Amino acid sequence: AIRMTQSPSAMSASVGDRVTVTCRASQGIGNYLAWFQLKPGKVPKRLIYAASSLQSGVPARFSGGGSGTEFTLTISSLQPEDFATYYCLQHGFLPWTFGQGTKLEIKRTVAAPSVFIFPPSDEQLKSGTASVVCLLNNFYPREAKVQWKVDNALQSGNSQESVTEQDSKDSTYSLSSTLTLSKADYEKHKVYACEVTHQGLSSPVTKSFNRGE
Amino acid sequence: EVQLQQWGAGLLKPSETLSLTCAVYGGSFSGYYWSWIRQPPGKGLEWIGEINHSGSTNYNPSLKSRVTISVDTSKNQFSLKLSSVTAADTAVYYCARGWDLDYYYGMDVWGQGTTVTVSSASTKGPSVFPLAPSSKSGTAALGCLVKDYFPEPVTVSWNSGALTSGVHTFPAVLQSSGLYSLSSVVTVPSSSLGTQTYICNVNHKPSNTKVDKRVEPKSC
Amino acid sequence: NLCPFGEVFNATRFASVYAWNRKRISNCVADYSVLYNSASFSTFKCYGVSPTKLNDLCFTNVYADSFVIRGDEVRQIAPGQTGKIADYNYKLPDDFTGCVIAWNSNNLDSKVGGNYNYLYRLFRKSNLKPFERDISTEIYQAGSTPCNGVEGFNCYFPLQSYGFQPTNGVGYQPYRVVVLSFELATVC
Numbered sequence: 365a366i367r368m369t370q371s372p373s374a375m376s377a378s379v380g381d382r383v384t385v386t387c388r389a390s391q392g393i394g395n396y397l398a399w400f401q402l403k404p405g406k407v408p409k410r411l412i413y414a415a416s417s418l419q420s421g422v423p424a425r426f427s428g429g430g431s432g433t434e435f436t437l438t439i440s441s442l443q444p445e446d447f448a449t450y451y452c453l454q455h456g457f458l459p460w461t462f463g464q465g466t467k468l469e470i471k472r473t474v475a476a477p478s479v480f481i482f483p484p485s486d487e488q489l490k491s492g493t494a495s496v497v498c499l500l501n502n503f504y505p506r507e508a509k510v511q512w513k514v515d516n517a518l519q520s521g522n523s524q525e526s527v528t529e530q531d532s533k534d535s536t537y538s539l540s541s542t543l544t545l546s547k548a549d550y551e552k553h554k555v556y557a558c559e560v561t562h563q564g565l566s567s568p569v570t571k572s573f574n575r576g577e
Numbered sequence: 578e579v580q581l582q583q584w585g586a587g588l589l590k591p592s593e594t595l596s597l598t599c600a601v602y603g604g605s606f607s608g609y610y611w612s613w614i615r616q617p618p619g620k621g622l623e624w625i626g627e628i629n630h631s632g633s634t635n636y637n638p639s640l641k642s643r644v645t646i647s648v649d650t651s652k653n654q655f656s657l658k659l660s661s662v663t664a665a666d667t668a669v670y671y672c673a674r675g676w677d678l679d680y681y682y683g684m685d686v687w688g689q690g691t692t693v694t695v696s697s698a699s700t701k702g703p704s705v706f707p708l709a710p711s712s713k714s715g716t717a718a719l720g721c722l723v724k725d726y727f728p729e730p731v732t733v734s735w736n737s738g739a740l741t742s743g744v745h746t747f748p749a750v751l752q753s754s755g756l757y758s759l760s761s762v763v764t765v766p767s768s769s770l771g772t773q774t775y776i777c778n779v780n781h782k783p784s785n786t787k788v789d790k791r792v793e794p795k796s797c
Numbered sequence: 798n799l800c801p802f803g804e805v806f807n808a809t810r811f812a813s814v815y816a817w818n819r820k821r822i823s824n825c826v827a828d829y830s831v832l833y834n835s836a837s838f839s840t841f842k843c844y845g846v847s848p849t850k851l852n853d854l855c856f857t858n859v860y861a862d863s864f865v866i867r868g869d870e871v872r873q874i875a876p877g878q879t880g881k882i883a884d885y886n887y888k889l890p891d892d893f894t895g896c897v898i899a900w901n902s903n904n905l906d907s908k909v910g911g912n913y914n915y916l917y918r919l920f921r922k923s924n925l926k927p928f929e930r931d932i933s934t935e936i937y938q939a940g941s942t943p944c945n946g947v948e949g950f951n952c953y954f955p956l957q958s959y960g961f962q963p964t965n966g967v968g969y970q971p972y973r974v975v976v977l978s979f980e981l982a983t984v985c
């Protein structure tokens with residue numbers, strides 16, 4: 365019943381910065397607020413219990429505090445081993461409820477993506493389904509809008525996307541949007557386009573091809 | 578110091594019953610609540626329920642009385658039962674040391690987790706289709722589309738692991754058909770399209786499937 | 798002449814544990830065996846004295862302390878126990894010679910959206926003395942920063958409410974508690 369609003373949803377920072385995430389409780393939960401760290405593949409570990417108390421073995425840069433209604437997890441000098449997703453948990457009133465999380469990602473300079481478009485192979489067309497793949501590579505801002513245009517008709521509801529984690533070297537993301545279409549629908553149209561809107565591009569770039577060429 | 582070891586089947590069909598068990602080896606088993614937490618793929622954490630040494634249970638109302646949590650005090654174990662499962666119950670299920678009975682703080686120790694996937698799909702090998710570099714370009718891009726497979730995972734290498742730079746294998750995406758779909762991509766110098774060979778190495782252990790696929794520019 | 802135990806056990810409203818109610822009892826003729834045998838008490842534990850009614854009709858001043866806590870905290874209403882209730886709300890001395898009675902009251906003290914009327918002290922700078930009762934609503938300073946009676950960062954209101962919903966587990970359901978102490982002037 366109790367809403368736990370966690371802000372911001374995601375945030376960028378660099379090593380050595382001071383970072384505070386906030387968790388806002390719907391009702392007064394007094395001192396029953398826990399903070400957890402969560403990394404891909406790793407079991408979640410508790411960081412703060414009772415709003416302010418530090419779990420044993422957790423470094424001293426991690427701090428916590430609360431008012432009963434507004435809570436705050438703070439990292440003084442950020443380290444590489446702190447880039448993860450942080451969740452708060454209230455246990456003031458049943459049912460216990462979590463926050464949506466705050467993902468802590470590495471800050472770097474703006475990097476425009478490299479866009480590529482891939483028509484469906486003849487081998488796949490023989491099976492009766494067509495897959496058009498658009499690829500965004502090497503971009504720092506996660507914010508990216510990919511729009512499919514089939515003969516200048518904006519396609520929605522048949523496009524599934526996927527994104528990598530921050531690369532361990534250049535700290536960029538890459539994104540694949542796959543448009544799925546039946547063979548009949550595929551052969552009903554000529555121009556297949558992938559339009560990409562990204563902060564690092566002054567104008568939206570469009571990569572396209574013509575069925576058959 | 579204190580460790581939790583959990584187990585149970587993680588591959589279920591809908592309407593089946595998930596049954597996980599957690600074993601405690603360390604802290605006094607009586608002075609704590611023992612709880613279950615869930616994390617659906619990319620959807621944050623959700624508290625399922627918990628039980629104390631005396632058998633008192635707190636459940637999350639979100640589960641419509643489908644949850645039953647039991648305790649065995651002579652083996653220091655506690656179990657989770659979730660009936661009438663659907664694909665919405667696909668998640669990683671952890672057991673954890675919940676709240677103590679003195680000052681009521683907890684979630685100290687966690688189980689290693691159990692990956693649970695609820696799908697009426699049968700084991701299927703992937704079809705591998707080429708993503709050819711277009712007649713264009715500096716640097717070029719090519720790859721493979723690994724489609725129609727169940728369950729996870731698939732392992733993709735390039736040239737039998739001879740090339741790793743610029744590779745990007747995207748996390749799988751569950752299609753509306755219940756099968757998984759993935760794409761692996763390489764950026765390579767566009768002056769290497771005629772001299773160097775690029776080949777996908779796709780492995781799907783559940784179906785015992787290996788597919789090698791050569792990726793070349795499509796001739797006009 | 799028959800004692801007013803009804804007014805305590807049957808009482809329509811019970812007190813928050815931090816502000817526990819204390820009733821004096823004198824000119825009392827009471828059957829204590831009839832209470833000990835009542836299945837309506839899930840908990841009835843006598844430390845030191847033990848259940849017997851031939852003891853002087855009534856002692857000099859029988860005290861009946863009453864309040865509401867949750868299920869998992871009932872074990873704390875006992876000598877030598879440590880916990881949030883025993884540290885901050887209601888303590889019994891080590892030489893306690895009296896009885897502790899408890900019963901589940903989910904049907905009386907639980908609302909569907911949560912009964913927020915029963916509260917307990919959540920913070921205190923020191924442990925209670927036995928039979929101490931603290932009504933202070935002073936803003937508790939959890940951190941190093943003072944509060945100056947203003948809530949805020951590490952600056953809590955010292956009392957927290959129980960949720961008390963009927964759907965709670967038995968450990969988090971309300972339990973009504975009565976503690977009878979016997980002191981020995983004159984004897985009634």
Ligand SMILES: *[C@@H]1O[C@H](CO)[C@@H](O[C@@H]2O[C@H](CO)[C@@H](O)[C@H](O)[C@H]2NC(C)=O)[C@H](O)[C@H]1NC(C)=O
Nearest residue numbers: 800801802803804805806807808831832835837
């Ligand atoms: C609390 O209330 C109940 C019900 O009013 C009392 O139980 C009654 O006790 C008398 C004997 O004293 C019996 O003859 C009745 O049959 C009982 N009624 C029921 C339904 O149990 C109880 O005595 C009260 N508590 C105290 C201390 O008086």
